[PDB]
UniProtKB/Swiss-Prot annotation, chains A, B, C, D:
GO terms for biological process: negative regulation of glomerular filtration; phototransduction, visible light; purine nucleobase metabolic process; retinoid metabolic process. It comes from the Eukaryota. Changing residue 105 to C: In AMYLD1; amyloid polyneuropathy. Changing residue 38 to V: In AMYLD1; amyloid polyneuropathy with carpal tunnel syndrome. It comes from Homo sapiens (Human). Detected in serum and cerebrospinal fluid (at protein level). Highly expressed in choroid plexus epithelial cells. Detected in retina pigment epithelium and liver. Homotetramer. Dimer of dimers. In the homotetramer, subunits assemble around a central channel that can accommodate two ligand molecules. Interacts with RBP4. L-thyroxine binds at residues 6, 45, 108. Not glycosylated under normal conditions. Following unfolding, caused for example by variant AMYLD1 'Gly-38', the cryptic Asn-89 site is exposed and glycosylated by STT3B-containing OST complex, leading to its degradation by the ER-associated degradation (ERAD) pathway. The modification Sulfocysteine is found at residue 1. Changing residue 115 to S: In AMYLD1; uncertain significance. This is Transthyretin.
């Protein structure tokens, strides 16, 4: 698992469950092409997005559909979504965890990049 | 201002100075049209991006060019940029302060919305 | 001010108004002596806590009474308070802005330190 | 494991390893008594602090020695430590994860409270 996404809810102190996440890779013509997607699990996690073979160096965008999440809870949110845009770099073996901490009018995102 | 951006540097404990910011507005054909741009001042603030008249209802994207900021300080950061996407003015004119707190592998963004 | 505190509410997208703040300074016997206190204004800001003369070198604690804030808005929050503990002025007088961004189960705090 | 602490480093995009953590419980005389302590693992995690039997309702403080961590990396930090103060509440079965995201001049903390 080279790429994992974790989403947490700072209003309820809980994982953010059933949040849609879309991953895109930047193509040669500068457009964002779909790469992977899914919904966070009961633990707020989305695993199984990609494989080492597929996850080549490039610019990726992770879009987290925060608005739908807050609307399902009845809470008016600020953002349309949260976006995390980054370059994947081969620099020895690497695993990326993209975490997002959600509030209605704020989010924080962190990247944890480790070498198994 | 109807729209102000504030950027802080969590490594130095200081405003993030000379940070480029680009604002886009979603057009009718679903593309991102350039709306306004500028650079943060010595206070980390960017004022004067738009006017009440020009800042109509819409979906806006504020793109903060964090990678360029970090690289100039000798840090190879994770993100390409910090992006903030939001519907504005859809219940009438509001004032928006978009704040970002930057670290090399993390950022936080908060919006303060006020009714004039 | 040599010391200013700013508190924001990430649920409402607004300043956190009427938030009690208590400042303490570590005394020679290792106890926390009361130093200054106040409440945030309608801008979420608390000014006028101390003076350059009184704000000597020391270890200071800024305690932000977040639980009381949340409870008054109908939220049962996680934290008792947000605490910020720091050495101040140990290479001469500085100005400190202590910012806090509040959610019910999370907060962020950032310090901006400037040399007058 | 009713109580777990996770510490992340936002400057390096990594777990924060070998960080000292101390847990205290508030005693009847309002003083903080040592409860549990340890050092974060290679994954930034500290497990095994307490047991269900021991971890009774009360006010707890988790102190994370951030200053020592940044000093070991050569990075000048703002905070003496990070503190997380909270009430444990029996409200059905409960597990607490206290996460901290560290930068030199900022930290964020989040509590994830779940029911196995």
């Amino acid at each position: 698992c080279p790429l994992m996404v974790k989403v947490l809810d700072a209003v309820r102190g809980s994982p953010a469950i059933n949040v849609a996440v879309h991953v895109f890779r930047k193509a040669a013509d500068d457009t964002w092409e779909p790469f992977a997607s899914g919904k966070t699990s009961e633990s707020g996690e989305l695993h199984g997005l990609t494989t080492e073979e597929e996850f080549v160096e490039g610019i990726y965008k992770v879009e987290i559909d925060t608005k739908s999440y807050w609307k399902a809870l009845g809470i008016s949110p600020f953002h349309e979504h949260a976006e995390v845009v980054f370059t994947a770099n081969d620099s020895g073996p690497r695993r990326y965890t993209i975490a997002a901490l959600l509030s209605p009018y704020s989010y924080s995102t962190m990247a944890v990049v480790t070498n198994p």
